[PDB]
């Protein structure tokens, strides 16, 4: 799934952000001064020639700043009240699935379907009046359609091919154990940290021997700036039963050689 996101915050203090994404991985940014498309990796160009890239830059210029101006010119009659934020996400995926959705104040507001903008029902007549503005040029809607059903599939195809090496790399996790901060009385919180792995799918469990401890509470998977991932898995146990416990990590990159760490040494303490 490649998509472009647009974040526009209005205070009439302002802010305009455009960036491109392969799911979790950022691949493009729009520099708000050079009006250029900055490529965050060598392979961010996909198989798109430099001149087709200047074409794309032309259209990102014109539509980003006509969209900001249009939003601010119509805000009165649309009853957009300051401060407010507009968010847009558009791109393509199954098989050739495409999408373009717009939110106002963090809620579904309008979306683009085939050839025209449609309001989400719950968003009311305000969203309906917005579609009128959004639908004032059928040709501009036809351009949007072709951006979604033509340009985006070809781009994502070239992008995935160009980036296959980076996207399918295997980075081994490291792990470590610590005491968790808020155990109940008479209990300990054992924490198993897993960091530096890629790609995202991972397995981590506290164990007693070969028995998985179902009390294991996995946290969110969190990002690092270097593009790898982080996870904390905790287990609450009675202080008497923390001996034979270990943390076991399985990951594609380890090829069956699980990381296994043992609650012990000064962690008991012996």
């Amino acid at each position: 799934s490649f998509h472009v996101t647009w974040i526009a915050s209005f205070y009439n203090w302002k802010q305009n952000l455009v960036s491109g994404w392969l799911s979790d991985l950022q691949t493009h940014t729009w520099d708000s001064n050079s009006s250029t498309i900055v490529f965050l990796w060598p392979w961010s160009r996909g198989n798109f020639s430099n001149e087709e890239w200047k074409e794309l830059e032309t259209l990102f210029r014109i539509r980003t700043i006509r969209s900001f101006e249009g939003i601010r010119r119509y805000a009165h009659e649309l009853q957009f009240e300051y401060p407010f934020e507009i968010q847009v996400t558009g791109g393509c995926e199954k098989v050739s699935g495409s999408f373009l959705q717009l939110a106002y104040q963090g809620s579904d507001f309008v979306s683009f379907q085939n050839n025209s903008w449609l309001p989400y029902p719950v968003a009311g007549n305000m969203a309906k009046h917005f579609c009128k503005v959004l639908n004032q040029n059928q040709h501009e809607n036809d351009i949007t359609h072709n951006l979604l059903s033509d340009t985006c599939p070809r781009f994502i195809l070239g992008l995935l091919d160009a980036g296959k090496a980076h996207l399918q790399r295997q980075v081994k996790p490291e792990a470590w154990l610590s005491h968790g901060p808020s155990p109940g009385p008479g209990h300990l919180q054992l924490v198993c940290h897993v960091s530096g792995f890629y790609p995202k799918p991972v397995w981590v469990m506290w164990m007693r021997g070969e028995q998985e401890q179902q009390g294991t509470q996995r946290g969110d998977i969190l990002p690092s700036a270097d593009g790898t991932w982080y996870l904390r898995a905790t287990l609450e146990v009675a202080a008497g039963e923390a001996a034979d416990l270990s943390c076991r990590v399985k990951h594609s990159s380890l090829e069956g050689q699980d990381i296994v760490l043992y609650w012990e040494g000064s962690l008991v303490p012996r």
């Binding site: 968010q87 939110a103 104040q105 963090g106 579904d108 968790g180 530096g196 700036a225 270097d226």
Partner: protein
């Protein structure tokens, strides 16, 4: 009503080892509107050079940001993340949890 309060999670890139360079992270997510102020603190004092990722949002339109800095911990230093947002009565402070050791000689 339409506002969402930030979740704040603090973690290190590598295990804490005194005198070895490391990276401290503060992941702020699930908030709306996007205006937010995030500081990394060392012994209660703001750390001058901190970076963050480009602002993004999830499927449910809530925003998220990663803040991080390179640092070298010693056994005496405490680190934290301090977040202020319209949803918060007062800045919320989440500490970096590390063991440190030497519970008693």
């Amino acid at each position: 009503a339409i506002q969402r309060t930030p979740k704040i999670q603090v973690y290190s890139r590598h295990p804490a080892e005194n005198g070895k360079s490391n990276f401290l992270n503060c992941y702020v997510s699930g908030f709306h509107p996007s205006d937010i102020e995030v500081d990394l603190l060392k012994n209660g004092e703001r750390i001058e050079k901190v970076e963050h990722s480009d602002l993004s949002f999830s499927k449910d339109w809530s925003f998220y940001l990663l803040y991080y800095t390179e640092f070298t911990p010693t056994e005496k230093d405490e680190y934290a993340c301090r977040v202020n947002h319209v949803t918060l009565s007062q800045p919320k402070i989440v500490k970096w949890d590390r063991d440190m050791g030497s519970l008693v000689p």
